[PDB]
Each structure stands twice: as structure tokens, then as C-alpha cells.
Symmetry: C6
Subunit: 71 residues, 6 copies
């Protein structure tokens, strides 16, 4: 649903469902290693060693997963 974010929504939903570990590079140069708990259009909820991280997507540069998502 909602066009122009089919890749984005699918990919983050795969990361979350598959519990794939990923490095999330922020545009400020900081980085987090975690699993996707949830997302909406503007934010992602992360688990980093049992603590919760709410990351704004405008702050995100890259997702780097441990293993690839099936397309």
C-alpha cells in the first residue's frame, strides 16, 4: 500500500521479521548495531543489546545487514 516506498517498507519489514542484525549508519557519523522492532514512515525502533533506540529516518544513512534479504 502507499506508493513509492515499496522497497523501503518491504526491506525494513524483512529485517524485523527475520530478526537480522544490522549496522545502522547515521548521517552524523554515529552507528548502531541492532535489530528492527518496528517502523513507521519517519522512525525505526531498534533493539541494541536489550535497550530501545528510537531512530528518526532522516538521521539514517544506511542499513547494513548481516545477511541479505530475498527480493
Amino acid at each position: 500500500k502507499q506508493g513509492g516506498q515499496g522497497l523501503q517498507d518491504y526491506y525494513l519489514n524483512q529485517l524485523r521479521k527475520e530478526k537480522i542484525l544490522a549496522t545502522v549508519f547515521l548521517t552524523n557519523g554515529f552507528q548502531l548495531r541492532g535489530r528492527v522492532v518496528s517502523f513507521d514512515n519517519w522512525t525505526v525502533l531498534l533493539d541494541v543489546e536489550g535497550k530501545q533506540q528510537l531512530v528518526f529516518k532522516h538521521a539514517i544513512s544506511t542499513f547494513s545487514p548481516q545477511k541479505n534479504v530475498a527480493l
Copy 2:
């Protein structure tokens, strides 16, 4: 009853607000705040930091890092 595509954001910040959970807020410029959520809209967050008020624009916010986890659904 929600504006689509911001249900996670709105709920989480509201949970942070209602529970008055202390959080470290990392800004995109590398600055950081330790405080509690007083209010929010679509574009800004109002923080309580040691009894002083900080109005933070969400575009400048990178991460919310809470002291206690928020209950989801």
C-alpha cells in the same frame, strides 16, 4: 484514530511523555540532552532538562535513548 505513518512515533513519544521516562536525546550535530518529554507535535519536542525547558526540532533529533523500555503492542 491516528494520522497514518506515524503511529509508532506518536505512540512512543506519548508513552515517553506519559511515563515521564528519562531519556538521552542525541542530536544530528552530535550534541545530546538528558531529559523528559513534556510535549510534542509533528515538528518539535518539548523537553524538561533539570527543570529547564528545551524546544527541540525533530529534524535535529537523531535518537531517543530511554532509561526504561517502552511497552509496545
Copy 3:
């Protein structure tokens, strides 16, 4: 009139009460002044009697000298 009531109210109180505030930019640069006006994208600041038009996308935080009610 939008989903922006917190921001509009707060900047409006800062203006009306003439509260002095430090405005930290995403630059890491900062301005210390009073708000004269704003719309959705900009704020007009008074800094030692001189006018500064700051874009809101460039702004990080408003830090007021005294709290807004």
C-alpha cells in the same frame, strides 16, 4: 490549522513574553536573542538590536532564560 500547535504556541509565548533565548543551530553555531516573528519556515530574531532571519530547518533547539507556562 495543522499539526504544529506546540511549536506555534511556544514561539508565540517567547515572542509575547519577550523571553531571551539561545538558538542553537544544526551548525553548532548559536544565536542569543528574542523572537520578533515567525512563519512555518523562518523565525525573525532580535540580536542586540539587529535582525536575523533564521530558517527553521537550520535550528536545533530553543533554550529560554525562563520557562514558558
Copy 4:
């Protein structure tokens, strides 16, 4: 016309009409000293010592005029 940019459009139009010199601080830390030739919603056209500068507004931090605009 066009609500929520009454301050912005008026102020930049005053700078342009009045030919007031201003320092334009960019969010990258660079700065230009010039006069407003034109603007739309996303850009400003600047004159800096006789040469033209097209500045994107998303790149602009602050306008600092030599003299104040009448409100």
C-alpha cells in the same frame, strides 16, 4: 498569498526591493555577502560583487542584513 510563509516572503522581498546588503550563512559554515535578486520557494538568486549565486534555501541558515526591515 500562500499561508505559512508570510514572514519569509515579505522579508526576502523587502531585502530585494530595498537592495539591502546581507550576509547569508549557509548551514555548511560557508557564507556569502550579497543582495537579493530574486526568490521562489526553494531558491534565492544572489548578487555577490557582480556575479550570480543561486542558493538553495535548504542550504541557508541565516540572513544578516546591514539594516533592519520595517515590519
Copy 5:
């Protein structure tokens, strides 16, 4: 389907032609890879067989090894 025909066509050619490209981020950081997919906000890159989901707001420029027609 928008005002975004240049961008959509170009990334689509890069993908179809399998052109290797350097992707410079607003970070000053860079990625060297191939485009697997994109939507309006993200691009999927192949970097040495590993997947990188890069947000378009984080991207500065695409620099292709060979020109697109």
C-alpha cells in the same frame, strides 16, 4: 507519475546496465556498488555481494563508471 523522471530513469538505467558506481554520501562517506532496487526514498546497493539500503536524503551524487545514454 511525478516530477522525478530524470532520477527514476537514471537509476533505472544504472540498474539495468549493471553500471558500477560510487555513491557519495552527505557524510563525506562513500559506497562503491551496483543498484539493485530503489523507491522514492531509498536505494538498494550491491557492494561486493552484500546489501546496503541507503536513504536518498543521505546521498550526494551518483558517479557512474561509464555514462548513461
Copy 6:
């Protein structure tokens, strides 16, 4: 015939494009390019830099600095 609020931008980049005027393009990260406009839409610019193609996102662009001034109206 124009999309409101981008008449200056669209005209100027099109003039730069039609005249093939050489320009220095300063990016927000401090990087810079010297080239000519091949194409643009709302979100990107295509550059010719010494015969090589550069697709620049407009959000990463700070300034266009032209070699020759563009004729306005």
C-alpha cells in the same frame, strides 16, 4: 505554464542547461564540482564534468556559481 514556487529555480537551471554555461556547484558537505547542466527534475541534477556524468541530488546542493550570468526577466 509553471509549477508554482519554483519558477526561478526551474528557469535558471534550464537557462544553465540550454546555454551549457559552466558552473561551480558547491555541495552542502563542502565538496564541489565544475561542470555543465545536462538535465534536471524536481529532485536531481545531471552534470557533465569533463565528459563524465554526475547525478547530484538537489538536497546536497548548496550553490550554483556560474561562469557567465544568466539573463532574467
